Amino acid sequence: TCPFYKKIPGTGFTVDAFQYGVVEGCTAYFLTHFHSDHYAGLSKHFTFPVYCSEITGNLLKNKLHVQEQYIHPLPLDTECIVNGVKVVLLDANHCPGAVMILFYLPNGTVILHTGDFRADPSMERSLLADQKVHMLYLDTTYCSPEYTFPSQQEVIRFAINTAFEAVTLNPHALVVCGTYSIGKEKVFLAIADVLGSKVGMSQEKYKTLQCLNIPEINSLITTDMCSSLVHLLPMMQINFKGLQSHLKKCGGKYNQILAFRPTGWTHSNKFTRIADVIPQTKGNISIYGIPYSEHSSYLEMKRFVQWLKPQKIIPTVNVGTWKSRSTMEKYFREWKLEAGY
Ligand code: NI
Known part of the structure; x- marks a missing residue:
């Protein structure tokens, strides 16, 4: 009721x-x-x-x-x-x-x-x-x-920096961003903008994004994975076993992933600032949590x-x-x- x-x-x-x-x-x-x-x-x-x-x-x-x-x-x-x-x-x-x-x-x-x-x-x-x-x-x-958590602009700063650093250091590294609903599109659009790329995604996510009246969206996004160096994946999939799996599929075209998990609040907001962030690391895959909030x-x-x-x-x-x-x-x-x- x-x-x-x-x-x-x-x-x-x-x-x-x-x-x-x-x-x-x-x-x-x-x-x-x-x-x-x-x-x-x-x-x-x-x-x-x-x-x-x-x-x-x-x-x-x-x-x-x-x-x-x-x-x-x-x-x-x-x-x-x-x-x-x-x-x-x-x-x-x-x-x-x-x-x-x-x-x-x-x-x-x-x-x-x-x-x-x-x-x-x-x-x-x-x-x-x-x-x-x-x-x-x-x-x-x-x-x-x-x-508490930082401003969205502070966070988009960090991101544009991490990504652009690594890609210029290693030009064969892929940026991955996690997603599971609409929201937080600025994370991936901002990174791809700084990398001179479109964002690549599944057919179903492409379909969802094409409903949002984003200006110039045809220039920003693609379903051709091969042609892109910012990819979107399900948030479920943003882990080592799953990112390994994905890193195989790309067919020896990248020798390092750098991932971002935009999340809400987590308990590490209580003790660590955004400028002093680190990722987990199992080999050549590096997963960032970044607290980009839409509440x-x-x-x-x-x-x-x-x-x-x-x-x-x-x-x-x-x-x-x-x-x-x-x-x-x-x-x-x-x-x-x-x-x-
Ligand atoms: Ni909501």
């Missing part, structure tokens, strides 16, 4: 709730972004409206094969009427096509649902700057002060919430245990007492 934190009061609307069957009263099923936890359930056999971004809609039509009529894409940053409820979609700074949704209820309540987001100061000069938000449905993935750090989240001064906060992540719920409420209370709202 659909949880209350996936329903919007005073509407027939639900958010990311595609895995329960029909939800009684639901005129509309919103989908914030194309990640399997949020979309779990959709297929070609949906015949209710889905409202989402254009990019999420391309993925619905081409990867899940939903029929064009039931995908209502909406532009971003545009006031839109949806069953005589005003809504706006705003960029979530998550993966491609990820949005937050502003709901303007008839009764005068305003609700923001963040979907998955990496909070940023550029959001403080968006359409949110214009009016009061009473209820916040909040991505609480890293709501604890241990969760808010604790500080980033804190700042956004203290700016917004919502009257009420509804967590959407880590809500499955009483201990996590309780810990989260305590931080929300501190933030409110500090900030005077």
Whole structure:
């Protein structure tokens, strides 16, 4: 049964709730972004409206094969009427096509649902700057002060450096980047840019990338592995036995891999900086973990919430245990007492 934190009061609307069957009263099923936890359930056999971004809609039509009529894409940053409820979609700074949704209820309540987001100061000069938000449905993935991690630009720096170093030192080395969903495309696009290359990938990943409205994408990516020296592989496969396997396939064309595992937080964020990173090493394969996050750090989240001064906060992540719920409420209370709202 659909949880209350996936329903919007005073509407027939639900958010990311595609895995329960029909939800009684639901005129509309919103989908914030194309990640399997949020979309779990959709297929070609949906015949209710889905409202989402254009990019999420391309993925619905081409990867899940939903029929064009039931995908209502909406532009971003545009006031839109949806069953005589005003809504706006705003960029979530998550993966491609990820949005937050502003709901303007008839009764005068305003609700923001963040979907998955990496909070940023550029959001403080968006359409949110214009009016009061009473209820916040909040991505609480890293709501604890241990969760720090670097900026995405800092990390793309490290990467462009490691890669360009090694390739210039050994011109027969391959760069590999791990992936398992959309997100984090900047890692591989940035490295390939510095190496004078396209990125090579499976047919299925090529298909996924061609749905994202990336400008100039035909010049950036290829399914011809042979012709490329930045390759993408499944994240499952980014290990020694699996990278050995792959290093064979390339047919004596490279004598060293240098891999990157963009990950979220790990416990080695607590004791090691990004400039002082190392990889595991079993022979000529060298696997880097680099903490490129598409969720808010604790500080980033804190700042956004203290700016917004919502009257009420509804967590959407880590809500499955009483201990996590309780810990989260305590931080929300501190933030409110500090900030005077
Ligand atoms: Ni996500």
